[PDB]
């Protein structure tokens, strides 16, 4: 029963581990979300501007 309890404790550990691992995936994913958005915004401003620059 203590080994059953040992399974239970490792289970709660792994459950909160799954919480935080989903969180790590989400942290990189939202880091990626902001990267594509802001990097896209920067390259787009830069691109239409350089278009404007050389064509001007």
């Amino acid at each position: 029963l203590g080994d059953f309890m040992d399974k239970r404790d490792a289970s709660i550990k792994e459950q909160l581990s799954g919480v935080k691992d989903t969180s790590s995936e989400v942290k990189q994913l939202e880091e990626q979300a902001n990267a594509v958005m802001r990097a896209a915004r920067a390259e787009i401003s830069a691109a239409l501007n350089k278009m404007k620059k050389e064509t001007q």
Binding site: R8, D9, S11
Partner: peptide, 28 residues
Amino acid sequence: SVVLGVLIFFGKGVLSDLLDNRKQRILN
């Protein structure tokens, strides 16, 4: 005697209450 009656009552209260908090932690 019934010292142990009232005592087993409140003491298993504290004991199983603490273990109730332990399994409650396993849940929460």
